[PDB]
């Protein structure tokens, strides 16, 4: 019933590990379909070969800008941006997958994986999934980031797709 997608992560081309995500399509369906479809690449464009452009140790890893590769772009499968579906789920801990945005109703394709409890984000970013397998791969990724987000090595989504 709820889709599961994976990401095979790479640090400058060396394979690092697989993170897999359960998308809560039963509560945030339109948000979950957009991450699912961008992971499969079935609509022609997507995450494969994009990188995490902003990694802040102890906060979150952000990625998903496949058009401009630096947080200023990305687009959804419904157009460039769409509404905040709802705020049922909250940022309760590491592994929560939440939507990045540029204020309300500006969701595109950028997402962030929390590596800590970030309750201040509640009510401001739609949560739509959580890490299933691979959280120590997300944790190891932190080491390649910095206080301001700049990463030291290129961290890419080498491959991604749907598992179930």
């Amino acid at each position: 019933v709820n889709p599961t997608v994976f990401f095979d992560i790479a640090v400058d081309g060396e394979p690092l590990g697989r993170v897999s995500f359960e998308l809560f399509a039963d509560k945030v369906p339109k948000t979950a379909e957009n991450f699912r479809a961008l992971s499969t690449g079935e609509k022609g464009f997507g995450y494969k070969g994009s990188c995490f452009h902003r990694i802040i140790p102890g906060f979150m890893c952000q990625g998903g800008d496949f058009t401009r590769h630096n947080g200023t772009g990305g687009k959804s499968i419904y157009g460039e941006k769409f509404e905040d579906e709802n705020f049922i789920l909250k940022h309760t801990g590491p592994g929560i997958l939440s939507m990045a945005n540029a204020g309300p109703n500006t969701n595109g394709s950028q997402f962030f994986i929390c590596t800590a409890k970030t309750e201040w984000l509640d009510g401001k970013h739609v949560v739509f999934g959580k890490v299933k397998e691979g959280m120590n791969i997300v944790e190891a990724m932190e080491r390649f980031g910095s206080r301001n987000g700049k990463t030291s090595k290129k961290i890419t989504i080498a491959d991604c797709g749907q598992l179930e």
Binding site: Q62, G71, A100, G103, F112, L121, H125
Partner: peptide, 4 residues
């Protein structure tokens, strides 16, 4: 840009 967000999350802040």
């Amino acid at each position: 840009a967000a999350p802040f």
